[PDB]
Amino acid sequence: DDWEIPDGQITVGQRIGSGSFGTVYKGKWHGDVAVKMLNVTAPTPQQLQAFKNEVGVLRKTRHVNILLFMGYSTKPQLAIVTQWCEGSSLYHHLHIIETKFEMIKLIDIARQTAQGMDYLHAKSIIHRDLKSNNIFLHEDLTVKIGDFGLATEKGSILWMAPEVIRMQDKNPYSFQSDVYAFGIVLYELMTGQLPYSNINNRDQIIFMVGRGYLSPDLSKVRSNCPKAMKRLMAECLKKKRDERPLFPQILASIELLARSLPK
Amino acid sequence: DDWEIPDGQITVGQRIGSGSFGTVYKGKWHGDVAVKMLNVTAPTPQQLQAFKNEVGVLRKTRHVNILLFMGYSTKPQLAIVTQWCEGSSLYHHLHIIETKFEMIKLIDIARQTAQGMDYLHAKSIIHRDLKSNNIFLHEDLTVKIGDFGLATEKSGSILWMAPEVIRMQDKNPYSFQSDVYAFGIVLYELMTGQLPYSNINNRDQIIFMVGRGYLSPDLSKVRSNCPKAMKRLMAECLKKKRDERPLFPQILASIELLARSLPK
Ligand SMILES: CNC(=O)c1cc(Oc2ccc(NC(=O)Nc3ccc(Cl)c(C(F)(F)F)c3)cc2)ccn1
Ligand SMILES: CNC(=O)c1cc(Oc2ccc(NC(=O)Nc3ccc(Cl)c(C(F)(F)F)c3)cc2)ccn1
């Protein structure tokens, strides 16, 4: 009862993207599927250890808001097959084609991003890289979370929590760490913009956010953004680690201050 | 890994349905989820063996057209938690509220029902009970397959039952082919929007005639525009002889092909 797919099965289709550590190929296997090819020339030792994780950690998840894992493949290049998702990433929606989401929808995109994340931590899985770019809106409804990146190892700083920018310890990452990100994703949803937008200089934003001199200008949340939300938003972006809430509490908040809206 | 969910987590919500061997409770666990409660008074020996199957067989599947398995629960009653699906079952759509599906859609609902089934057999999992009632159209798009029944001691409905099964051979009548025949009826449903043997008002008979080969779905009901390429396949499946029906790898390919050719 394992999940290795014998080679010569997954009909590697066309290309989707490719970078530093990977290539995604929209393929075929009992249905449309995304196949992430890792190696090429040959498989590397450090590399191989990576694969054994993005998998062991994927197969441990099984929830409707997290990118489904179909199986892996040692054969012709290490390969991870995950359901193909039609549509585009949150980041694309908000900052590229600038779609205008009705408010209710926004609150729910968050709601789901919350459930997903709340599940990932239950299984004791720290994402280490949540961001609007990893929030995929499947079929334009239903948030699918995954690490759709390819220039990492396991970068992008806007969703990076202060402690992480500083790196004081060895393991800056933690459940809290992830929330801060969710905090920025939330801030995104409600203002429809990225943070530090006026500062045109990567090095600086990195430094100020690290020293506590910089923080998202919460005075941009939409006119109608629930006061109950903006509250929580700030509750997460808290610069102090242990002052941010876990997700069981986050989810409940959003959900509550949700049933009181459609009218 | 292990998918047992410690008790006191899945917030058992309201009721959804209940029968002979089960009760479904729309609950809560990191999100809306369906929880199938098996026992009550206490867990039975014959019962317990059942649970160990509907699970061992569920966790073995992992595909977008098959009802997602979230986890199980030995605690307060044996319980199987699967993603909740909003919407309704195919059977409901076609024969209860009688929605009128554009044709293209119908061909695709089948397309997916095909992919799902094609995956289930790959993992060497015979469904033993496919029917429009187990084909759930999630969010009104995306077929989710599962055994949404509760009056049959799992891992009562003859219309989708293939001849050999009605008769019963040696010990085990069920097989990949067996499942196709069902898919054949689900297809026949999709294209005529009706159930088979509709004019015969007598369960015992239908059972008998379908068994002896005297009865068969009246393929002359497929909609005016039903692709000739389809009706063909439909009949290809409903074949009364077992070994004359096609496996699913071939079925899927057929539908898919005779699909891309009709939009422009
Ligand atoms: C526009 N292109 C698309 O259409 C499209 C592309 C796809 O390509 C992909 C294929 C595979 C993946 N691999 C990850 O997701 N892996 C992951 C790593 C760590 C961790 Cl921690 C997790 C986590 F958090 F989920 F568990 C997940 C991502 C995207 C899929 C569906 N659609
Ligand atoms: C209207 N109510 C709903 O909204 C709703 C209800 C639900 O209730 C359910 C809860 C649990 C199940 N148990 C099965 O599914 N077990 C199964 C057995 C063998 C085999 Cl072979 C398979 C197979 F094929 F899928 F793998 C699946 C079915 C339905 C779920 C989502 N939504």
Query: According to the annotation, is A23 in a ligand binding site?
Result: yes
| A vs B: CB pairs below 8 A | 53
Query: According to the annotation, is A197 in a ligand binding site?
Result: no
Angle among Cα B89, A145, A194 to the nearest 5 degrees reads 125
Number of Cβ atoms within 10 Å of the Cβ of A34: 22
Q: Do A174 and A100 sit in the same domain of this protein?
A: yes
Burial group, residue B229, by CB count within 10 angstroms (0-12, 13-18, 19+) = middle
One DSSP character per residue, B114-131 reads HHHHHHHHHTT---S---
**Residue B192 and residue B198: Cα distance in Å, rounded?**
12
**Domain total in chain B:** 2
Q: Do A40 and A1 sit in the same domain of this protein?
A: yes
Which residue has 């089960």 as its token pair? Answer: B22
Q: Do A37 and A152 sit in the same domain of this protein?
A: no
- On chain B, the residues whose CB falls within 8 A of the CB of A112 are 31
Q: Do B155 and B45 sit in the same domain of this protein?
A: no
**Residue B143 and residue B83: Cα distance in Å, rounded?**
14
- Which element (helix H / strand E) includes B145? strand B143-145
**3-class state of residue A36 by DSSP:** strand
Q: Do A78 and A92 sit in the same domain of this protein?
A: no
Task: Determine which one of A129, A140, A147, A217 is catalytic.
Answer: A129
Sheet containing strand B69-73, strands side by side: B15-19, B22-28, B32-37, B79-83, B69-73
Note whether A233 and A183 are within 8 A (CB): yes
Elucidation method: X-ray
From A86, A103, A132, the end of a domain falls on A86
Q: Which residue of B has its CA nearest to A63?
A: B70
Tell me how far the alpha carbon of residue B218 lies from the centroid of ligand 2, in angstroms.
31
Note whether A145 and A134 are within 8 A (CB): yes
Residues forming a β-bridge with A69: A82
Tokens at A239, concatenated:
């610069």
Sheet containing strand B143-145, strands side by side: B87-89, B135-138, B143-145
Q: Do A34 and A82 sit in the same domain of this protein?
A: yes
Interface of A with B (CB under 8 A): 1, 3, 30-31, 59-60, 62-65, 68-71, 83, 112, 115, 118-119, 122, 139, 141-142, 251
Tell me how far the alpha carbon of residue B5 lies from the centroid of ligand 2, in angstroms.
18
**Residue closest to B50 by CA, chosen among B18, B33, B72, B75:** B72
Note whether B140 and B189 are within 8 A (CB): no
Contact A31 B139 (CB under 8 A): no
Cβ-proximal residues to B133 (8 Å cutoff; 6+ apart), any chain = B89, B90, B91, B148, B149, B157
B25 lines ligand 2 (CB under 6 A): no
Q: Do A2 and A120 sit in the same domain of this protein?
A: no
Q: Do A65 and A96 sit in the same domain of this protein?
A: no
Backbone angles phi, psi at A138, to 5 degrees: -65, 125
Q: Do A119 and A197 sit in the same domain of this protein?
A: yes
> Residue A56 maps to which CATH number?
3.30.200.20
Domain that residue B82 falls in = 1-86
DSSP designation for B59: T
Tell me how far the alpha carbon of residue A116 lies from the centroid of ligand 2, in angstroms.
21
Choosing from B126, B147, B153, B176 the residue with most ligand 2 atoms within 8 A of its CB, the one to mutate for a pocket test is: B147
> Residue A94 maps to which CATH number?
1.10.510.10
B148 lines ligand 2 (CB under 6 A): yes
Helix axes B103-122, B248-260, angle to 10 degrees: 150
From A59, A86, A113, the end of a domain falls on A86
Which residue minimizes the CA distance to atom 29 of ligand 1?
A: A148
**Residue A221 and residue A201: Cα distance in Å, rounded?**
23
B27 lines ligand 2 (CB under 6 A): no
Q: Do A99 and A61 sit in the same domain of this protein?
A: no
Helices (H), B168-227: 176-192, 203-212
Contact A30 B139 (CB under 8 A): no
How does B118-152 read in b/e, with b if 16+ C-beta sit within 10 Å? bbbbbeebebbbbbbbbbbbbeeebbbbbbbbbee
Tell me how far the alpha carbon of residue A239 lies from the centroid of ligand 2, in angstroms.
44
Contact A30 B119 (CB under 8 A): yes
Contact B64 A60 (CB under 8 A): no
Q: Based on C-alpha coordinates, what's the Rg of chain B? A: 19
Q: Do A178 and A255 sit in the same domain of this protein?
A: yes
B84 lines ligand 2 (CB under 6 A): yes
Resolution number, Å: 3.5
From A23, A57, A86, the end of a domain falls on A86
The single-letter code of the amino acid at B140 is: D
Q: Do B45 and B75 sit in the same domain of this protein?
A: yes
